[PDB]
A and B are shown apart, each in its own frame.
Chain A
Amino acid sequence: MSYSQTINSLVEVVLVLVPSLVGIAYVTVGERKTMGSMQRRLGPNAVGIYGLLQAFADALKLLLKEYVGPTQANLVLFFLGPVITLIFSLLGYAVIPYGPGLAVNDLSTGILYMLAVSSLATYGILLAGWSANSKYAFLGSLRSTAQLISYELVLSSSILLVIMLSGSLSLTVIVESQRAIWYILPLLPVFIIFFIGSVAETNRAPFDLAEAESELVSGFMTEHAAVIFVFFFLAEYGSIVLMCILTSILFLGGYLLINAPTVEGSFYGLSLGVKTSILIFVFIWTRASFPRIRFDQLMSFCWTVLLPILFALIVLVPCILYSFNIFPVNISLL
């Protein structure tokens, strides 16, 4: 190579983490300003020009706010759960292609990597809620466990239908395969279902049961203050963007367009971000449109509506592939 391995690895990680953590801060302001417009409001417009420094004041305010360790709380776990949720939520950005193979890890199995990292971070929510040893946080954590028993099979079922078309499990190859057609056209029911599960996966509304404010006070994060609360917020909003990126990876062609490398690489980055930003809007639009579902009804919806339909596609879709001679070669090509 031309320069050091460690430096190339260094600047690539920075170019991924730093712009993403900046992107996370603006989704929080953007949601507050988007719902307000739907609510005939303005949203943040006085912490920085047009309100563009609001997330930083919120972040800085909490890192200077006193932490409390409850006497009834198992304290090592009280701190371990938010730290697990944050680290393991942010790890999911290590396999996103911002171009063909332009990922921190172009892994051959990056889809399974994302399922492992998301599942491990939800276990922090469960642990932190239980550790608090307060009723509402206890009821919050039990809902989060019910919720993962609801959406995890749904996403894993949905993605397996994308892998049947792509044949790869590598995020770049799936995007490259969509140069034929975006997977939202042939897999239109799967796109709706995967999007529904992603909203449930992120504990976003209408599925905000674990942290519901009108039923529990803050659910799992009710005893959590200062930096611990901020760890859970960055995990949640970083999960929203990551799931919007993954939905764009799997159904909307990823980075596909709708000095010379820099000009080209920019178009891939914009194209992925534009499609991600549209799906980020759909989340915020969804929180603003609907009531909260009841947690019994979310479990029944995933288990008697979504999964029965997804199992039937899992049968139907390969039968269409063998019939039309369109099973993808599973070798390395794209």
Chain B
Amino acid sequence: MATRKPAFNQHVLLDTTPLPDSIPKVKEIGASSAPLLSASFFIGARCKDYNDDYMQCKNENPGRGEFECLKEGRRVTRCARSVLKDINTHCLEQFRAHWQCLDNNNQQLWQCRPAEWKLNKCVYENLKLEKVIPDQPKNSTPVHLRQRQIFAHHAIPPWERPFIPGQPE
């Protein structure tokens, strides 16, 4: 259906018809918005090649990406389920601690920095995955590793410290 944002939508239309047997089935990701934002930088750190392969396939078949790149899409869904399972079997308390703060904080990452710095160190030492943001200014300390967040309503506590992989306490 159209990508226009609706202004007079009073109804919703569904379609109980399933994808044909010729297309392999993929169990869809069951995670909601707040968990997916807390795991995004770990999805990226593990599924970049698959994510990058899907999008390059769609740019290789203009106007036909939906129908001719289905295998890549199943591959991204599977790759991104692996991280979700991995975070669950190894970081379950910290992961919930982070995306619950995110739900109460407008999904703003700067508003939940102490929960991210705990979840990230649990992910780094268990799933060996590390949050990387490209082209951050080199002079300035990265914003996700800054002790003081200027846009945070509750000030980051002095005891809570940022997590940098490869550095001990």
Q: Hey, what's the 0/1 contact readout for B97-128 against A, CB within 8 Å counting as 1?
A: 00000000010000000000000000000000
Does B151 count as interface, using CB distance less than 8 angstroms? Answer: yes
Is the Cβ of B151 less than 8 Å from the Cβ of A179? yes
Contact B151 A100 (CB under 8 A): no
User: Which range contains the number of A residues in contact with the other chain?
Assistant: under 10
- The A interface is mostly helix, strand or loop, or mixed, namely loop
Verify B150–A100 contact, CB threshold 8 A.
no
**Contact flags A166-203 to B (C-beta < 8 A → 1, else 0):** 00000000001001100000000000000000000000
A334 to B108, CA, bound (A): 8
Q: Would you give the shortest CB distance from A186 to chain B, in whole angstroms?
A: 15
A51 CB, min distance to chain B CBs, angstroms:
39
B106 to A179, Cβ gap below 8 A?
Answer: no
The B interface is mostly helix, strand or loop, or mixed, namely loop
Q: Complex formed: what's the CA distance from A334 to B105 in Å?
A: 11
Tally the A-B contacts, defined by beta carbons under 8 Å: 7
**Interchain nearest-CB distance for A251 vs B (Å):** 18
Chain A, Cβ-Cβ closest to B152: A179
Residue on A nearest B154 in the bound complex, by CB: A264
CB 8 Å contact bits of B127-169 with A (1 = contact, 0 = none):
0000000000000000000000011000000000000000000
- Chain B residue with Cβ nearest A260: B104
B106 touches A180 (CB 8 A): no
Q: Which residues of A contact B106 (CB under 8 A)?
A: 100
A179 to B106, CA, bound (A): 16
Bound: A176/B106 CA distance, A: 13
Task: Point out the residues of chain A lying under 8 angstroms from B150, CB to CB.
Answer: 179-180
Binding site for B on A (CB under 8 A): 100, 176, 179-180, 334
A-B contacts, 5 of them at CB < 8 A, read A176-B151, A179-B151, A180-B150, A180-B151, A334-B151
